[PDB]
Amino acid sequence: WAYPCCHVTQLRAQHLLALENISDIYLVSNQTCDGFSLASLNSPKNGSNQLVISRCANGLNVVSFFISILKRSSSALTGHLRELLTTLETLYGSFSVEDLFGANLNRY
Amino acid sequence: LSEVKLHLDIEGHASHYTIPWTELMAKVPGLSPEALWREANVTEDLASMLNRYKLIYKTSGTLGIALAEPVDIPAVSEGSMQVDASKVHPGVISGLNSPACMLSAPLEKQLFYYIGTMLPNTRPHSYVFYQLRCHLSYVALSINGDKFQYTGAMTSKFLMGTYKRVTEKGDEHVLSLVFGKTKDLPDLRGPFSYPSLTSAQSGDYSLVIVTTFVHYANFHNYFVPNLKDMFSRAVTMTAASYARYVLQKLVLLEMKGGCREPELDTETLTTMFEVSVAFFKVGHAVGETGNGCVDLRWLAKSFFELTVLKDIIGICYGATVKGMQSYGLERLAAMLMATVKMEELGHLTTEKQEYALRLATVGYPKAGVYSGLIGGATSVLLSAYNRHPLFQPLHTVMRETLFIGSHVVLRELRLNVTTQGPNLALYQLLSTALCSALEIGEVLRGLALGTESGLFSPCYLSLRFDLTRDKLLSMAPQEATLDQAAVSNAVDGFLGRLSLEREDRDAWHLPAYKCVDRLDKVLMIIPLINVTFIISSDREVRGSALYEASTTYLSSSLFLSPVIMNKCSQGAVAGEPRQIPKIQNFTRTQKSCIFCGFALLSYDEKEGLETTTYITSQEVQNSILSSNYFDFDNLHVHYLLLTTNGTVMEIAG
To answer: Phi and psi dihedrals of B23, rounded to 5?
Structure first.
């Protein structure tokens, strides 16, 4: 019903991935893993799809980002880029934050 | 880069959407994906994100009700000369009654000329909203010496005021309110959902509370806003109306001394937010009707309530406002006025009279350095006075009129350019006469019973500096039907707004002013045609002669110093004042206007000065000798007559 979940960690005193190199993003459902809104940031290294780097990100945060961009430019989008918003928002509201208080966040 | 695609999973199926922000960046200006992607900590380890959310207040009782927005802007009339705000034509393009309206596209761009940050970089906000930047306008506030401040940040779509207090230490507490159409609310960042942050909701309007629990505590100690009514009123109420509802709320606080002892309470804080909402309402109005046209009558009325509002907000608090004045609307209003028989405005209709003076205030700035604006304000007032006996109906349509006009007059007075001084001095004289015992008396009555807000009174510009804490309590109505306690508050309130609305320089223009040594003991000055009378409790005035009433009941004496030809001689009058001669000669019925350019002054033996009257024309003199203005069958009251000559006399015939 999705893809492997994970254990999201921050990358202290290094450098991060930008939008410049990422191009694929896999999201989860409000029941796949365990309530955790997780996302996978896939970006091909070198040239094409030879060796693909895939690291974890925070679903809710990611989804919120996209939800924002879509709304911020509604004057320039129709088709999928309009239904995607309404469907992406419903997804965003499918997760429950306040449950993570008692939930074990190292399940993965 | 450029192309990016994400995969989802509705019900058992994998969805595929590709978002090419590369093409989007071309069709959109402010869309900078690179920044937003970083703003939202993508790699925010599961655990740390949570606390960044739980340290945010939760609108537990998120309640809402039915509140459909009222009809505001009317549909442009017939041949309404629709003009651009960006540039006014080198000449006129209208008349006075001719239909007209302004284009929204330019008007709005002019109002929201300033650019800014609806969402600052403060710890609280940076946790919820996504850094935003668009054209806006705010309302600055600073009380307790930068120890507390408010900001009325607003855009063409939503308002977001923020409160900021500081404990003795570097402690900084902040809490903000967000108002606007639910569809226009900013973009939430982390795991945030507007519902758990919205306090009041309509079919399309919301009121959000952005703040941390830590802060909400320090604030709930002195700030418990009635979100319910505060929200409704901010939704179901025409722009112009809301503007005054607030203007009145402030006047109240003013009479409560809250303008020198700025109380940090729920009421005072509430009004603040509403003050910015009043400004937001106007901006949100011109916004809804994009590429449309707002009737000039609408602006002249709406933008007026704002100008008057901005002043009180400044006189009271060192608050500032910027981003809602459009030099266009001002030039237009200015030009329009310049093309009308000002000296004959009073002979016009009521509705037309307001609209006239109304917009006259809006355009006064940008133009009219030699336009007969103050003149019109005089003509309209003159008419009002002639039709009554020194007192305007407590709630007449015209009362509202004189209030609108006073503004353009006060502004004039505050200047240092003696222009239309004679024409202006008149305004003061009339209003002074209007500040009769009947006027001052009824105003109090209403204040106590709460029927009159006390927003305006001809006294605020009158030259009657006789009414004090005690003296005012004298004019107050003597009835058991009025709470003696409530009355006191009214008297105090009136005295308060009077000391704020009126200044000491409001008379730095009057020619005779330069002749008063101990000006603090001056009861009232009466600017006449060829002379100017100075009633005071001191024989120091250096006029032409010295008069003294027979009464000694008062603390001091009652003197009358007349400055002939508005020029005073060196030194006061010789010893022994001239006594006021008593006259019974004149008969009631009068053919011509005997006491024309003259004035009447009645004083009570026990109390101070009662009422004063300036007989403008024949009609007035008749409406005085016919009515029971006189009452010689009362030893306590006396009636004086000041002529064009420095002579004074008592009446009893």
So the answer is: -75, -30
Of the candidates B641, B639, B547, the one whose C-alpha atom is nearest the C-alpha of residue B594 is B641
With CA atoms as reference, the chain A residue closest to B191 would be A60
> Cβ contacts (< 8 Å) between A34 and chain B: which residues?
none
Burial class (CB in 10 A: 0-12, 13-18, 19+), B289: middle
Q: How far is CA B58 from CA B61, B195, B196, B219, B533, in A?
A: 9, 9, 6, 14, 66
* Closest to B155 in 3D by CA, of B243, B287, B274: B287
Q: Give the pairing type, strands B609-614 and B547-548.
A: unpaired
Residue B64 CB-half CA count within 13 A: 18
A1-108 is classed in which CATH architecture? Roll (3.10)
Contact across the interface for B187 and A64, Cβ inside 8 Å = yes
Q: Max CA-CA distance within chain A?
A: 44
Burial of B31 (0-12, 13-18, 19+ CB in 10 A): middle
Q: How was this structure determined?
A: X-ray
The residue ranges of DSSP E strands in A1-108, in sequence order, are 24-27, 38-44, 52-58
Q: Enumerate residues 6+ apart whose C-beta is below 8 A from B264.
A: B143, B144, B148, B165, B222
Residue type, B97: N
B6, B24, B130 ranked by CB distance to A68: nearest:
B130
Among B210, B193, B197, B190, CA closest to B50: B190
DSSP three-state, residue B277 = helix
- Distance of alpha carbon B560 from alpha carbon B140, whole angstroms: 47
Task: Answer left, alpha or beta for residue B2, where phi above 0 means left and psi between -120 and 50 means alpha.
Answer: left
| Greatest C-alpha distance within chain B | 110
DSSP string, B132-150: ---B-BEEEEEETTTTEEE
Measured distance between the N- and C-terminal CA atoms of chain A, rounded to whole angstroms: 17
Q: Are B280 and B138 in contact, with CB atoms under 8 Å apart?
A: no
Fold of B1-325: Naphthalene 1,2-dioxygenase Alpha Subunit; Chain A, domain 1 (3.90.380)
Q: A105 and B46: CB-CB below 8 Å?
A: yes
Residues of chain A contacting residue B44, judged by C-beta atoms under 8 Å apart:
8, 10, 58, 61
User: Helix, strand or coil for residue B16?
Assistant: strand
For chain B, the structural domain boundaries read: 1-325, 326-653
Q: Label residues B212-231 b or e (16+ Cβ within 10 Å = b).
A: beebbeebeeebebebeebb
Secondary structure class of B534 (helix, strand, coil): strand
Which residue's entry shows tokens 């603040």? B272
